[PDB]
Write a protein that holds these residues in place. Sequence first.
Motif, PDB file in Angstrom:
ATOM      1  N   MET A  12       0.889  -1.068   0.047  1.00  0.00           N
ATOM      2  CA  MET A  12      -0.173   0.056   0.172  1.00  0.00           C
ATOM      3  C   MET A  12       0.805   1.159  -0.131  1.00  0.00           C
ATOM      4  SD  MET A  12      -3.002  -0.966   2.803  1.00  0.00           S
ATOM      5  CE  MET A  12      -2.962  -2.810   3.545  1.00  0.00           C
ATOM      6  N   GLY A  13       0.199   2.535  -0.678  1.00  0.00           N
ATOM      7  CA  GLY A  13       0.846   3.540  -0.857  1.00  0.00           C
ATOM      8  C   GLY A  13      -0.468   4.666  -1.130  1.00  0.00           C
ATOM      9  N   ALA A  14      -0.392   5.547  -0.090  1.00  0.00           N
ATOM     10  CA  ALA A  14      -1.608   6.533  -0.040  1.00  0.00           C
ATOM     11  C   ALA A  14      -1.330   7.804  -0.637  1.00  0.00           C
ATOM     12  CB  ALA A  14      -2.139   6.389   1.215  1.00  0.00           C
ATOM     13  N   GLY A  15      -2.108   9.090  -0.029  1.00  0.00           N
ATOM     14  CA  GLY A  15      -1.570  10.335  -0.570  1.00  0.00           C
ATOM     15  C   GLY A  15      -1.551  11.097   0.914  1.00  0.00           C
ATOM     16  N   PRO A  16      -0.591  12.089   0.696  1.00  0.00           N
ATOM     17  CA  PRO A  16      -0.327  13.046   1.835  1.00  0.00           C
ATOM     18  C   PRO A  16      -1.653  13.692   2.525  1.00  0.00           C
ATOM     19  CG  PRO A  16       0.682  13.691  -0.361  1.00  0.00           C
ATOM     20  CD  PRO A  16      -0.250  12.458  -0.621  1.00  0.00           C
ATOM     21  N   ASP A  17      -2.668  13.725   2.166  1.00  0.00           N
ATOM     22  CA  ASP A  17      -3.849  13.918   2.979  1.00  0.00           C
ATOM     23  C   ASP A  17      -4.582  12.736   3.111  1.00  0.00           C
ATOM     24  OD1 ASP A  17      -3.542  16.804   2.627  1.00  0.00           O
ATOM     25  OD2 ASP A  17      -4.021  16.567   0.530  1.00  0.00           O
ATOM     26  N   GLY A  18      -4.327  11.672   2.809  1.00  0.00           N
ATOM     27  CA  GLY A  18      -4.971  10.286   3.096  1.00  0.00           C
ATOM     28  C   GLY A  18      -4.424   9.402   4.074  1.00  0.00           C
ATOM     29  N   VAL A  19      -4.840   8.358   4.306  1.00  0.00           N
ATOM     30  CA  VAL A  19      -4.482   7.238   5.176  1.00  0.00           C
ATOM     31  C   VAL A  19      -4.310   5.982   4.377  1.00  0.00           C
ATOM     32  CG1 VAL A  19      -5.671   8.176   7.232  1.00  0.00           C
ATOM     33  CG2 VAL A  19      -6.787   6.697   5.591  1.00  0.00           C
ATOM     34  N   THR A  20      -3.100   5.222   4.784  1.00  0.00           N
ATOM     35  CA  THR A  20      -2.993   3.945   4.069  1.00  0.00           C
ATOM     36  C   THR A  20      -3.644   2.894   4.624  1.00  0.00           C
ATOM     37  OG1 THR A  20      -0.776   4.959   3.889  1.00  0.00           O
ATOM     38  CG2 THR A  20      -0.815   2.623   3.446  1.00  0.00           C
ATOM     39  N   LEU A  21      -3.558   2.823   5.944  1.00  0.00           N
ATOM     40  CA  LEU A  21      -4.300   1.669   6.637  1.00  0.00           C
ATOM     41  C   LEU A  21      -5.086   2.496   7.856  1.00  0.00           C
ATOM     42  CD1 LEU A  21      -5.872  -0.882   7.047  1.00  0.00           C
ATOM     43  CD2 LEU A  21      -3.584  -1.723   8.409  1.00  0.00           C
ATOM     44  N   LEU A  22      -6.334   2.461   7.880  1.00  0.00           N
ATOM     45  CA  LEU A  22      -7.049   3.266   8.940  1.00  0.00           C
ATOM     46  C   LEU A  22      -7.993   2.246   9.934  1.00  0.00           C
ATOM     47  CD1 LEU A  22      -8.029   5.703  10.592  1.00  0.00           C
ATOM     48  CD2 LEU A  22      -9.474   6.295   8.498  1.00  0.00           C
ATOM     49  N   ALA A  23      -8.058   2.293  10.988  1.00  0.00           N
ATOM     50  CA  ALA A  23      -8.859   1.271  11.748  1.00  0.00           C
ATOM     51  C   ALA A  23      -9.644   2.014  12.844  1.00  0.00           C
ATOM     52  CB  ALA A  23      -8.262   0.327  12.373  1.00  0.00           C
ATOM     53  N   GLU A  24     -11.055   2.010  12.934  1.00  0.00           N
ATOM     54  CA  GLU A  24     -11.498   2.729  13.878  1.00  0.00           C
ATOM     55  C   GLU A  24     -12.476   1.761  14.651  1.00  0.00           C
ATOM     56  OE1 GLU A  24     -14.499   5.282  11.595  1.00  0.00           O
ATOM     57  OE2 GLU A  24     -12.883   6.454  11.241  1.00  0.00           O
ATOM     58  N   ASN A  25     -12.149   1.980  16.044  1.00  0.00           N
ATOM     59  CA  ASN A  25     -12.857   0.938  17.103  1.00  0.00           C
ATOM     60  C   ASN A  25     -12.797  -0.384  16.747  1.00  0.00           C
ATOM     61  OD1 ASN A  25     -13.502   3.566  18.385  1.00  0.00           O
ATOM     62  ND2 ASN A  25     -14.988   3.457  16.733  1.00  0.00           N
ATOM     63  N   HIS A  26     -11.788  -0.990  16.289  1.00  0.00           N
ATOM     64  CA  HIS A  26     -11.406  -2.285  16.161  1.00  0.00           C
ATOM     65  C   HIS A  26     -10.802  -3.152  17.236  1.00  0.00           C
ATOM     66  CE1 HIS A  26     -11.948  -3.600  11.617  1.00  0.00           C
ATOM     67  NE2 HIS A  26     -12.280  -2.349  11.700  1.00  0.00           N
ATOM     68  N   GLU A  27     -11.270  -4.222  17.257  1.00  0.00           N
ATOM     69  CA  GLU A  27     -10.729  -5.160  18.406  1.00  0.00           C
ATOM     70  C   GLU A  27     -10.337  -6.517  17.826  1.00  0.00           C
ATOM     71  OE1 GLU A  27     -11.705  -5.407  22.115  1.00  0.00           O
ATOM     72  OE2 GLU A  27     -11.075  -7.334  22.115  1.00  0.00           O
ATOM     73  N   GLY A  28      -9.243  -7.275  18.092  1.00  0.00           N
ATOM     74  CA  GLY A  28      -8.768  -8.245  17.371  1.00  0.00           C
ATOM     75  C   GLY A  28      -8.290  -8.086  16.028  1.00  0.00           C
ATOM     76  N   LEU A  29      -7.995  -6.858  15.560  1.00  0.00           N
ATOM     77  CA  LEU A  29      -7.249  -6.711  14.234  1.00  0.00           C
ATOM     78  C   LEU A  29      -5.886  -7.143  14.275  1.00  0.00           C
ATOM     79  CD1 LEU A  29      -7.408  -5.449  11.414  1.00  0.00           C
ATOM     80  CD2 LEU A  29      -6.947  -3.006  12.547  1.00  0.00           C
ATOM     81  N   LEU A  30      -5.523  -7.972  13.329  1.00  0.00           N
ATOM     82  CA  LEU A  30      -4.265  -8.393  12.997  1.00  0.00           C
ATOM     83  C   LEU A  30      -3.560  -7.916  11.583  1.00  0.00           C
ATOM     84  CD1 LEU A  30      -3.199 -12.177  12.749  1.00  0.00           C
ATOM     85  CD2 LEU A  30      -1.754 -10.232  13.404  1.00  0.00           C
ATOM     86  N   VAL A  31      -2.487  -7.033  11.894  1.00  0.00           N
ATOM     87  CA  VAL A  31      -1.790  -6.510  10.418  1.00  0.00           C
ATOM     88  C   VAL A  31      -0.531  -7.066  10.642  1.00  0.00           C
ATOM     89  CG1 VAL A  31      -1.507  -4.239   9.449  1.00  0.00           C
ATOM     90  CG2 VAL A  31      -3.571  -4.475  11.140  1.00  0.00           C
ATOM     91  N   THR A  32      -0.475  -7.832   9.518  1.00  0.00           N
ATOM     92  CA  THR A  32       1.036  -8.409   9.356  1.00  0.00           C
ATOM     93  C   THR A  32       1.370  -8.697   7.834  1.00  0.00           C
ATOM     94  OG1 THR A  32      -0.180 -10.837   9.188  1.00  0.00           O
ATOM     95  CG2 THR A  32       0.448  -9.644  11.313  1.00  0.00           C
ATOM     96  N   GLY A  33       2.668  -8.769   7.761  1.00  0.00           N
ATOM     97  CA  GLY A  33       3.262  -9.014   6.445  1.00  0.00           C
ATOM     98  C   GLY A  33       2.965  -7.980   5.421  1.00  0.00           C
ATOM     99  N   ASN A  34       2.782  -6.807   5.548  1.00  0.00           N
ATOM    100  CA  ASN A  34       2.352  -5.927   4.665  1.00  0.00           C
ATOM    101  C   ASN A  34       3.491  -5.077   4.217  1.00  0.00           C
ATOM    102  OD1 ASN A  34      -0.769  -6.220   4.539  1.00  0.00           O
ATOM    103  ND2 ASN A  34      -0.223  -6.113   6.614  1.00  0.00           N
ATOM    104  N   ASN A  35       3.597  -4.312   3.146  1.00  0.00           N
ATOM    105  CA  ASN A  35       4.802  -3.535   2.751  1.00  0.00           C
ATOM    106  C   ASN A  35       4.130  -2.413   2.317  1.00  0.00           C
ATOM    107  OD1 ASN A  35       7.020  -2.357   1.044  1.00  0.00           O
ATOM    108  ND2 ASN A  35       7.773  -4.540   1.079  1.00  0.00           N
ATOM    109  N   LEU A  36       4.002  -1.354   3.329  1.00  0.00           N
ATOM    110  CA  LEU A  36       3.457  -0.078   3.289  1.00  0.00           C
ATOM    111  C   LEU A  36       4.660   0.878   2.831  1.00  0.00           C
ATOM    112  CD1 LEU A  36       1.178  -0.612   6.424  1.00  0.00           C
ATOM    113  CD2 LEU A  36       0.935  -0.975   4.118  1.00  0.00           C
ATOM    114  N   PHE A  37       4.278   1.309   1.934  1.00  0.00           N
ATOM    115  CA  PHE A  37       5.399   2.405   1.172  1.00  0.00           C
ATOM    116  C   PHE A  37       4.965   3.876   1.278  1.00  0.00           C
ATOM    117  CE2 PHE A  37       3.830  -0.587  -1.880  1.00  0.00           C
ATOM    118  CZ  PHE A  37       2.995   0.258  -2.624  1.00  0.00           C
ATOM    119  N   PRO A  38       5.657   4.708   0.824  1.00  0.00           N
ATOM    120  CA  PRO A  38       5.260   6.160   0.632  1.00  0.00           C
ATOM    121  C   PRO A  38       3.898   6.954   0.042  1.00  0.00           C
ATOM    122  CG  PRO A  38       7.539   6.237   0.360  1.00  0.00           C
ATOM    123  CD  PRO A  38       7.115   4.804   0.747  1.00  0.00           C
TER     124      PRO A  38
END
Lengths: 399, 399, 399
Positions: free
Chosen positions: B214-240
Amino acid sequence: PNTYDVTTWRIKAHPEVTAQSDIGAVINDIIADIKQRQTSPDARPGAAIIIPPGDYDLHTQVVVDVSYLTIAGFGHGFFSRSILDNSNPTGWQNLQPGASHIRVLTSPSAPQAFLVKRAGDPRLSGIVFRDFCLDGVGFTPGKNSYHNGKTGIEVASDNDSFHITGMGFVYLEHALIVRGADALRVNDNMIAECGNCVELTGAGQATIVSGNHMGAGPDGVTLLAENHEGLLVTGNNLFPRGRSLIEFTGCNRCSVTSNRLQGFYPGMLRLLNGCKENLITANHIRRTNEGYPPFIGRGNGLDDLYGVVHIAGDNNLISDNLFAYNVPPANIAPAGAQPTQILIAGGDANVVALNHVVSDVASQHVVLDASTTHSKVLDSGTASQITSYSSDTAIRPTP
Amino acid sequence: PNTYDVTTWRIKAHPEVTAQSDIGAVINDIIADIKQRQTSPDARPGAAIIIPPGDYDLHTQVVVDVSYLTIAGFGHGFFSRSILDNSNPTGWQNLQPGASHIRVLTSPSAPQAFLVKRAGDPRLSGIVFRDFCLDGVGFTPGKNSYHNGKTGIEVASDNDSFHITGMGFVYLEHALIVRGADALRVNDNMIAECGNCVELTGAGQATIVSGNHMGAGPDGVTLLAENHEGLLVTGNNLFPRGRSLIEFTGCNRCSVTSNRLQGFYPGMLRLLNGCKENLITANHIRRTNEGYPPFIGRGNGLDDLYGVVHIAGDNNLISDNLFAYNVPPANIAPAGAQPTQILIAGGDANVVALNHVVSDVASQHVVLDASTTHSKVLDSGTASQITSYSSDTAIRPTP
Amino acid sequence: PNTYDVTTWRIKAHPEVTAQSDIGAVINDIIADIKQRQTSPDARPGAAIIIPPGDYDLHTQVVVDVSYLTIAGFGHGFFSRSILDNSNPTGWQNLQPGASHIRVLTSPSAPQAFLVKRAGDPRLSGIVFRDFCLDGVGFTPGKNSYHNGKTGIEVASDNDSFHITGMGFVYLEHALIVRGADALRVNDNMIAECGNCVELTGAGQATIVSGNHMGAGPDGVTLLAENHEGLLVTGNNLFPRGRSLIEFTGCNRCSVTSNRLQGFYPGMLRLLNGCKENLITANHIRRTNEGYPPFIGRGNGLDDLYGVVHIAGDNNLISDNLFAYNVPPANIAPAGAQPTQILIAGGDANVVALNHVVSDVASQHVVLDASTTHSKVLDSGTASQITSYSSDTAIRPTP
């Protein structure tokens, strides 16, 4: 539309040349039809080539020069040719690999079953190779040589967003090669009984290699990365007998986490030619002796002082790893020597923390050679399980 | 049965409205036929809509209101529109995204290419979006604005067991949005050159986001989570160049492990509005300066005292992470200030252990703000690389 | 070629026996046609059996005895039968699982929907089960019994390189069982509301279990492994109410990393009958109390002194884990007792480092039973949060 099935497509000038006799010829004629049709740089969607369950001979090398080309099958069809070659086939119900099975019978002048390359500008992008089988048929001269001069898939031009998944590679001198990989994804593949498994040469950026099953050859590499940055290697299960299992040369800021490594030789994990700022953590590293007779007595030319993990570079963090070392005193090189789990060959600021070692013999958990400077060793062994040939090394005993 | 190919399906009242002119209209008519046929709550298997390799225009928003609907293509067909827009296209062999390529040409009144929602009871379940491409075509007014009011896939109703894989999202103000996600899975996708990549709003449970690019924008989010429980974020390649790469607001007991993060701005990893009991470990965090000219000089409005990793909450464990920070003294905000790697903004009992920092300048590895209480900092820097504005902080120097 | 669609294939001797009435019978007749055709051990590519979106009844057990057999659908179609069974269905738009939905209606004498097995030599290899749904329909006698005697997929013979992905298992007493697994891959599946989810019995080697969503039953296991070596369990989101979430009996050198675990009972993670040299790290472990009424008051027969994580073996490394424990004092067994997060039941040389515990009550973060020897506890709690019944234990206080 833009979907072909290799078995239904006839070559207009050569009708009896089928996917069965030369699927290589068939695919090249399909690509020719794709280029036939998509002549506009603004209208080049690509296509999909489906490879039905079956046995196919590839004599002619396939040159892939169209972006967004998808070649897919219905299975990886792996089958251990190694065990067949060293066993008694009598009454065996299967003697060969299956699923969408491509038998690579390439000539010396065109090694690669698939060679992806294109001159000119836009770099090739979005090419997908999935769910099919590439089999090198056999090794030559020795049936256990891991040599045969064939390559499964080779990407020679700078590429972007390539995806390689669900594949089955077997008995190939080189399974997969990818030069100048950018945002590449190699995941969920079975690459084994190959001289070399995955080779990311040239240079790279934000590449991901995960969920793969790999086993290479004594004179080959399992996973090799050249001048890569942002490489993520995670959740892979790398097993026996590459010369190494993970080998980086001059890669920076890469990460090797949550992996299972099992090797029969010294240097299963190598950070060579100045790799900087890499993270090697949460991996299970097990070194043991070769157990299958056909290969007993073969090595990678390295001794046990090379270290199971060999680091030459700066600011790398090797932590939270479990080392399980079981090797007969008599197989240990040099006689009388204590095996080295982690060797910090050279480099500045390397940090080694929380690395549990389990060994059948007296072993030096961490060795920092006299070239190293400002290294940090925490909770990776008692003072007598750690050798520091430097004098600025900061060490903290595992109580 | 229950399988459609968008290219063969004619709209009875509108025959020349094809997948090429309005695949949106085509899919809506297919869904209308599905509902036509499956009227029994005990007989609603769903269906699969296949999108052949090609260039398709989407003018009409697709409303997905049937459970177990699968929309699949043969490729993610990513292509860097950003580089095209900032380069000289002359002689370029490709000017657009490929594979099962859908060009989102939506109107303001119906932004989303796909809008999944349904009233009444059973929540929507088992919907699968895979192996195809969503392209926003371009940014408006500025070609590098990351704004265009279009969204790729949006899930506005509570859902269960959704699966989003092998996708290609490009040049969309919002690639993917999923509200009230439960047992959701986002994996093996290429989401880049989008204003926002993945937005899990509302609330969530046992969601998995892995193997993504994933690659987003200056005014945006790449990965965003709201009131999450048990979220697993793994093995991702998040760039600029999201404003952030990972951003949780009020999520509890989630985990961010084995990831590769690369940002050009402050606050790449954010735990906001009281996130509690989360695990951030085994991640490679690299902060550096923007290197592509068209975007040089743009920021996210945050200074270097915000911290590469910003935590506001209690009992979170940030450990076994590698920080590689390379930023020109002159790009550092405020002039003269020392960059903060980890900032514990507020909260009780946070624990920061074994975090290796590498930076070109003097930097405060960990800063505990005066609001913090009972924090723990172990092996994450020397005493002078650690600032504690609290007095109950327990610190243990990296020897 | 070698591609079948279950809906188009007629059983010559029994024409009205369709995939809808008995897909089991249909698939067995297809396998019979495959064996019909591929009689040569050197020509047995296998085939693909496609299962179209739909509702199919399976009365007859499918015996899979051909290598490289691929049975694929277009979706996992999960649907919570548990919530339906404990809710008021009035006006519900869906009452059943979807996608390529197979309703397992097997007889006691042939429990398994799919039974993979073969005699003679070559072990079965390359079999792939993907993107379809196996639904047990209901539990019997109690609607919430998690008992019904049905099994989804069972592999009873030694196998190599099997692949199980994108599946949907629901309401089955045993979802998946695989004995003698070697290079097995179980990934990207939804296995829930099953008595037992994944059972790797007999023994195993280099197996990978990742990216899965699993929830079992009070009397069942979520993930169980017997005498496995080289097992990698990573990136899974295991949720409520197996008797355990991960259970190894006598496995050696395996690894459990980057996972999300959530249970309502003691012993969510178990290393039994002498598991040696395993790595359990970077996992989020959350123990709490059962919240859904239908199941309130039911347990697994263990008390809170069993420990959330129970280890019986030698040289295992439990580190970098986050424990979140929230359980009513009144639900704590034995009254007055302090819950045990990590219990080292027996064994030599186990190491426990950097484990953050958060609990609503006084709890013993680590307990080393009087049988243990030479254990190491580092940064896993203050001295009063640690109980050592041994005298050779080395403990280092979390400052």
